[PDB]
Amino acid sequence: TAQSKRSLWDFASPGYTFHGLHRAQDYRRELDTLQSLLTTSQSSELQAAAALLKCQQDDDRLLQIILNLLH
Amino acid sequence: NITLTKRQQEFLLLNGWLQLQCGHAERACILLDALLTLNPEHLAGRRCRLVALLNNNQGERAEKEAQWLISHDPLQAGNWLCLSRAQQLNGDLDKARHAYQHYLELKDHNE
């Protein structure tokens, strides 16, 4: 049922999102801190999460260069 | 030993939830698995991953997660809807109907 699926998505929703007066600075700060924190772990699952965060942190830096070239 | 601050827990939860909306079920599960490895009692993260498990096609895992949530709050209707959906994905239709009846008995019919 579509209604049950919507009720499921409503149940999964945390009901809020990123907040604060400087969520742009706070996101890059927590991202950089968390990726170095989880890298020190021995669990493969935590290492996978750290590697995923590092990838997007640097894949975006590649896209920023493209945007500058494209103005 | 690693301990997550509240902001770091929030970071993983919200990035996982937003990636799940972006159709990146893999990214969501990796992030939410990491959160729930370090904070196993993070209820909102458990709910988000359970629905993500239902979308990465991991029904047997989803059933155990729903049973985990039910034992923490047996009166929360949404836990029983999650159990019903995992069980019908796993082919146990008759059990999925009993779980759905529990969902109806507990849900807020005003929502």
Numbering used by the authors:
A (entry chain B): 50 to 120
B (entry chain A): 2 to 112
Give the published text.
Several gram-negative bacteria employ type III secretion systems (T3SS) to inject effector proteins into eukaryotic host cells directly from the bacterial cytoplasm. The export gate SctV (YscV in Yersinia) binds substrate:chaperone complexes such as YscX:YscY, which are essential for formation of a functional T3SS. Here, we present structures of the YscX:YscY complex alone and bound to nonameric YscV. YscX binds its chaperone YscY at two distinct sites, resembling the heterotrimeric complex of the T3SS needle subunit with its chaperone and co-chaperone.
Our crystallization constructs contained N-terminally truncated YscX50 and full-length YscY with an N-terminal hexahistidine tag. Similar to other T3SCs the concave face of YscY forms an interaction site to which YscX binds via a short helix α1 (S53–A61). Moreover, this groove is largely lined by hydrophobic residues and allows for the binding of YscX’s L57, W58, F60, A61, and P63 into distinct binding pockets. A second interface is formed via the interaction of YscY’s N-terminal TPR and the two longer C-terminal α-helices (α2 and α3) of YscX. The helices of YscX are rotated by about 90° relative to YscY with the binding site containing the hydrophobic residues I3, L5, F12, L13, I31, L32, A35, and L39 for YscY as well as L80, L83, L86, L87, L95, A98, L101 and L102 for YscX. The C-terminal helix of YscX extends about 26 Å further out from where it last interacts with its chaperone, as measured from L102 to H120.
